[PDB]
Amino acid sequence: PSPNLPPGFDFTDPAIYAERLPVAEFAELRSAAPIWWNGQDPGKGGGFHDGGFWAITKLNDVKEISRHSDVFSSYENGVIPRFKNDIAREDIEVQRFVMLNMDAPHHTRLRKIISRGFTPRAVGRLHDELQERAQKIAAEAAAAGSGDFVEQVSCELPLQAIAGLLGVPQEDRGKLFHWSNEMTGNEDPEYAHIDPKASSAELIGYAMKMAEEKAKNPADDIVTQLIQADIDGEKLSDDEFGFFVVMLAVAGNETTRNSITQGMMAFAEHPDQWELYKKVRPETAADEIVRWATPVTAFQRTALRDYELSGVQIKKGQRVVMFYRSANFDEEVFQDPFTFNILRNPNPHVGFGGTGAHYCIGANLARMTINLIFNAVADHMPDLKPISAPERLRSGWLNGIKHWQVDYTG
Ligand code: HEM
Numbered sequence: 198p199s200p201n202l203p204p205g206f207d208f209t210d211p212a213i214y215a216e217r218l219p220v221a222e223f224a225e226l227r228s229a230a231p232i233w234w235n236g237q238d239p240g241k242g243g244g245f246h247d248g249g250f251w252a253i254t255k256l257n258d259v260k261e262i263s264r265h266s267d268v269f270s271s272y273e274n275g276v277i278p279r280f281k282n283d284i285a286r287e288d289i290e291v292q293r294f295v296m297l298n299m300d301a302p303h304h305t306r307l308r309k310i311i312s313r314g315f316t317p318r319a320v321g322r323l324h325d326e327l328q329e330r331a332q333k334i335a336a337e338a339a340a341a342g343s344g345d346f347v348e349q350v351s352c353e354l355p356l357q358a359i360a361g362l363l364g365v366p367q368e369d370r371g372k373l374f375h376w377s378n379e380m381t382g383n384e385d386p387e388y389a390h391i392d393p394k395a396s397s398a399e400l401i402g403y404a405m406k407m408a409e410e411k412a413k414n415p416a417d418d419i420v421t422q423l424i425q426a427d428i429d430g431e432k433l434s435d436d437e438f439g440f441f442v443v444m445l446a447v448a449g450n451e452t453t454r455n456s457i458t459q460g461m462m463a464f465a466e467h468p469d470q471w472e473l474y475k476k477v478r479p480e481t482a483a484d485e486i487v488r489w490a491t492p493v494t495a496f497q498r499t500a501l502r503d504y505e506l507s508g509v510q511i512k513k514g515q516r517v518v519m520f521y522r523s524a525n526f527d528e529e530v531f532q533d534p535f536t537f538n539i540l541r542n543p544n545p546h547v548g549f550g551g552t553g554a555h556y557c558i559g560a561n562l563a564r565m566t567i568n569l570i571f572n573a574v575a576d577h578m579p580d581l582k583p584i585s586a587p588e589r590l591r592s593g594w595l596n597g598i599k600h601w602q603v604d605y606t607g
């Protein structure tokens with residue numbers, strides 16, 4: 198029995214996500230075809246011209262793919278499964294210069310080096326400044342009376358976390374945030390004029406200057422740890438540091454932002470959970486917010502060899518797309534997946550990916566950012582009420598909220 202889906206339905210179609218999350222359609226796949234060939238017509242593959250991909254809708258399958266990086270490659274086609282339909286292949290392949298889109302051994306070396314900058318100690322060192330900034334952000338928003346929650350509450354703290362972790366001087370944080378904002382969303386009419394190429398080039402230029410500077414003047418950020426050689430001589434070259442900064446500027450911005458906005462939309466829809474949150478401030482809330490928000494709807498891999506996955510024969514060269522948005526609501530794994538439960542524990546969501554070589558190195562920074570902002574929102578605008586519907590982002594792989602007017606005072 199084929200799944201009950203519109204003909205030609207494409208789970209990476211940005212026009213879907215500009216309007217809604219295709220929740221019923223994912224549930225239909227989990228029930229009727231949990232691994233399903235998602236065909237794509239010529240010219241309508243979001244930059245990929247291979248006729249389609251396998252949709253992976255079950256959490257255990259997402260985990261199996263993520264564990265078997267020796268078979269399922271990030272490098273061959275990158276992990277983003279949708280660009281503009283006319284993107285040039287060469288512009289896909291430049292994604293291979295960042296860790297995210299690298300296979301072992303190149304990935305292994307870089308991840309080892311980069312891990313020096315995401316130690317528990319490094320991230321914990323940011324806690325107090327980010328807590329102060331969260332309080333001020335929420336205080337300033339509450340003072341404005343009403344406004345765009347996305348811009349006045351969700352946007353700033355993730356960017357300040359990247360700035361603090363890298364040690365970007367305050368006067369440069371405006372340009373850092375601009376470069377970060379120019380790298381995402383170019384398929385949405387609101388961002389049709391952003392130039393991700395120019396911004397990445399400018400950011401690499403900035404980052405290599407910083408690398409050269411912080412090498413002369415060792416400062417207690419992660420940068421020194423990254424560009425000073427270890428016993429084996431291992432370190433990021435200046436351009437590798439630049440590629441890392443580009444990666445972090447993209448990774449550390451919109452996904453956490455959209456977690457915050459959709460977490461508050463969930464609280465607005467589930468007032469008992471919001472009352473419980475305000476009273477107890479459970480940090481398990483962060484992971485339920487990430488599960489509920491699944492800010493990365495999907496990442497892909499490419500099979501390097503034939504591989505049988507839950508009874509389906511995957512062929513060498515085919516893409517598989519891990520729909521984290523489906524896996525995070527998998528009825529076989531979660532009890533009442535469509536209940537928003539901020540006490541859910543354990544919460545084995547794949548919002549940060551499946552465990553494996555490419556598991557999100559920023560997961561605990563994101564969780565901290567989320568816990569700190571919602572504490573500040575509870576402290577300063579406990580009674581906020583939405584004014585109108587969120588405006589969703591046109592993207593085939595990011596679950597984004599562009600705008601959401603709320604009354605911070607109720
Ligand atoms: C709620 C926010 C976030 C979400 C939903 C998220 C999601 C993910 C996912 C799903 C992956 C898996 C990649 C794969 O298997 O192909 C990943 C990896 C990654 N994340 Fe995040 N992430 C978030 C925040 C962050 C932050 C704040 C940072 C950095 C400051 C970050 C940096 C990275 C990096 C560098 C990787 C790639 C690691 C590697 O290839 O070894 N992420 N993230």
Ligand SMILES: O=C(NCCN1CCOCC1)c1ccc(Cc2ccncc2)cc1
Binds near residue numbers: 277294397443444557
């Ligand atoms: O840097 C990323 N692409 C490569 C960018 N090029 C680098 C060099 O040439 C110019 C451009 C990238 C792509 C997607 C994400 C999404 C994400 C969010 C949170 N966690 C993990 C992943 C982040 C970074």
Ligand SMILES: [Cl-]
Binds near residue numbers: 531
């Ligand atoms: Cl559960």
